[PDB]
Symmetry: C3
Subunit: 370 residues, 3 copies
């Protein structure tokens, strides 16, 4: 969808209505922790709005230029195993960005950093809104410097007519109750979000592609903006329950993937053009390394980069992973020292590592995170 | 496919061959009721032919302009639940039109209205033929006022060379026998039709898209017109067995959806621009309402409109639904009375309500159907 | 991918690296038969390279003009049953060409014809490489006389930077060990290859379609060429194990399909324009015939044509099929005798019939193969 850097536009309308929806549908029986966390979120509405529009205007989204249109099966295809060369990091998808930003928001909320938690939650909802956008051509025709297309600017002009204020039921029944059933957030999210995204692709073909009339486009905007608002209210309800009840979604499960979220210092020359690798060592002395490389320019000064790693040994638990590190390898003969500010490592929806570094890494060097 | 308003063209050839196929393959052991109903259908061939081409030339198909090309997974995506905002009616698909017109044909046949039953059966086969048409671009390039494209007009010129006169086996064996196995018509139809539609999408990419040669196009027309004729013969065989044996496909199952087929009187000003809602009330006093809104202009004078409703409570049987109604809500301050001629409600492949109304509904009023 | 008729280019690089990969990853425990067959393959590298590029420059690929881009679900859709008119032969797909050429290579290797076996194996890998090529528009824009597109010529210029030399593990662990688990080669191949092809379609939409930048294209070439090389090393490892251990993948299973690979003599006028049919007769006297017809010109002088037949009776074993034949039917009144040189029939991954003919077939005649 469209949105503006000041926290206005379609994206901000969707998360604003998501909270309004929950306030209207919130059952009388919901626990007081959930009701109290909803009021903290309401206090931080402006951050939720900024978060919701930010990803289209971030720099780190690899110089470029933004395109937030994926085939709905991308995430599923990338999860398969066999079909990915394991030494390469997996690219970000709208599906994986929802999970990463969700894990970050839960982590921040729990340590009492509500401003930052809500900004991250907004960013998760941005990507959910994008995967529900009914636009799936092979070749994109962008009309602005932030990578939006005409269907989104058309909906933007008309956004106020598509607002909804209830999902049709209270949070003790059907839609909302089914969202709490699966404890594994990542597993739930993958299936839940995929349903909305596939319906958006069907609607692209039947009503929103460029050959369709303006009436069809208006209809496509109405139904997909109502699906966006409903799906968004569902994520927010799930979020409130997870942080109120102190749910850990990672509890017990194998570690198939690890996600690194790396913040490079804003200091002049802190970025690097050398090869960077992430590595682990398990309890039984087996190791795995990965290349950290996304399409654009990785590890630029002041960037926040995301790398997703697929494990070869699928039977591991988080507690089996004893050590982790980052390793630099010189690309040229000329020094290009690297200064990370902080690294967060996420496994099954939990931030398991949050380490401030703020040290220069030079030459061919291995920096131990743990 | 192409077709003409007088019951000629590719569509009419497909249903004509569908009956010819069944006459050739009809086993010696088929019951006399099936054989007798086949002769009544043969007597009404002209209606089957008109029905088969009519939907491209109907008005109510929302002013417009017609496009009968859907992604094969549309129906499946729309059935999911979670991914549809329940207050909105679901849009018609080629898949859902086959089920609606099939239910109407069975209903009419059983009350001895063979002309009308066969016209409805033709209309069901029109939509099956369309979903088997190998044309699935994101953007459609229509070449006539009825929304046809060049692949269909190319096949139209060559239609007589693609005719088949047998599916390769008798109705006591394989293809035909498997069609009778599943008693739930709607469930069978969904899976059966989807196989032909997906094969049509594969063939679109390998042989029928515009970059392919004329030889490839001819091959695509040959195989997909033979699949259309075979699939059509199968539906007709299933129809003959269902009406001969007095099968009820709705028997026992939960009501997940309700379909309203509304005929608005042809009387001047009978149509309306006010908001229209459909509603039910179950045995335990729980209610649900839906907005009736399709992309074009709903409830126009003399129109026959179709609305598909998704139930929130998935455990209901037909006999649990005690009352149903339609409710009007004024859009402007100026009167715009509405006059329906008849409403048919369909649940799991059965016409459960068939009520003649022919009364003016005004103001903000609730009209009880039952 | 691109490639040249002299056994150079991207395709040849992929199969060359596939062997290099296996040499690096080959476990110390692999049996000496596997190690010895790898050295015979290394001796025949030039044939593996020629095989890998040949299919883009063959004539029989039906005059035309080549297009090796399929939707990933094509093979799966064609296997369904119900959705194919059984009297017509099924068209070739990248998926089915991998299976056909694999069966031919295994057959040749076993009779000691290593040159020809390795050339066939190359041809199987050509088609695997194509289905892993991330290019899936509805309409193709070819830029050379062999049907290549700009994404492939762009990767061709840069091919040397994308080479990999290991899959990341030894052949005693994970990736490689899972490849030997399923004994039914055809079943394994269908699922294995489909994973790579679906990932290629996702990458087409996110990075390789024409609207994406050059950086995105470079990234798409890197990951998909590494997937091609990895998948290719896996097929080659499977091949070495199947021929070393004398595996029969057909053992026990029902015959759902039969594949005919027909070589027409190079003699002047050996080809034919008459209708050609293939037929069988089972132990219980039941027969089935099929039309042999592909989109282009079938049975041209010196051609090697492939026809895939779907059986109606799905419960048959290979030993139930007693007789097979080819039947000619005059198209015109003027003689057009046909001279086949050899017919190979393949069932579940085994060459079950290999008959030299080299006899003229005239008029309306049935030629018994067995
Ligand atoms: Zn957006
Ligand atoms: Zn976006
Ligand atoms: Zn049509
Ligand atoms: Zn139509
Ligand atoms: Zn190629
Ligand atoms: Zn090729």
């Amino acid at each position: 969808w469209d949105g503006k850097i000041d926290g206005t536009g379609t994206h901000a309308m969707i998360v604003t209505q998501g909270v309004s929806i929950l306030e209207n549908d919130l059952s009388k029986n919901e626990p007081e922790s959930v009701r109290k966390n909803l009021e903290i979120l309401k206090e931080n509405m402006h951050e939720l709005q900024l978060g919701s529009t930010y990803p289209d205007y971030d720099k780190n989204a690899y110089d470029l230029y933004q395109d937030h249109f994926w085939d709905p099966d991308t995430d599923n295809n990338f999860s398969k195993d066999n079909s990915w060369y394991l030494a390469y990091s997996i690219p970000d998808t709208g599906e994986s960005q929802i999970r990463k930003f969700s894990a970050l928001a839960r982590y921040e909320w729990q340590r009492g950093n509500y401003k930052q938690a809500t900004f991250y939650l907004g960013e998760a909802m941005h990507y959910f809104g994008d995967i529900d956008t009914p636009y799936h051509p092979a070749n994109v025709t962008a009309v602005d410097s932030a990578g939006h297309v005409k269907f989104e600017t058309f909906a933007e002009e008309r956004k106020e007519q598509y607002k909804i204020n209830t999902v049709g039921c209270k949070t003790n029944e059907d839609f909302y109750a089914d969202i709490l059933k699966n404890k594994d957030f990542n597993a739930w999210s993958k299936e839940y979000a995929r349903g909305f995204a596939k319906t958006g692709k069907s609607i692209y073909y039947s009503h929103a592609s460029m050959s369709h009339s303006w009436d069809d486009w208006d209809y496509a905007a109405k139904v997909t903006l109502a699906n966006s608002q409903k799906g968004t209210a569902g994520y927010i309800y799930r979020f409130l329950h997870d942080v109120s009840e102190g749910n850990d979604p990672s509890v017990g499960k194998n570690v198939k993937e690890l996600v690194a979220y790396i913040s490079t210092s804003g200091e002049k020359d802190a970025g690097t053009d050398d090869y960077m690798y992430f590595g682990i060592k398990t309890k039984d002395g087996k190791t795995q390394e990965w290349e950290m490389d996304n399409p654009g320019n990785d590890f630029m000064t002041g960037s926040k980069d995301t790398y997703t790693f697929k494990l070869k040994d699928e039977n591991l638990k988080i507690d089996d992973i004893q050590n982790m590190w980052i390793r630099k390898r010189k690309y040229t003969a000329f020094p290009d020292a690297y200064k990370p500010e902080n690294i967060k490592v996420i496994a099954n929806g939990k931030v398991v590592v949050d380490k401030d570094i703020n040290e220069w890494i030079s030459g061919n060097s291995t920096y131990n995170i743990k």
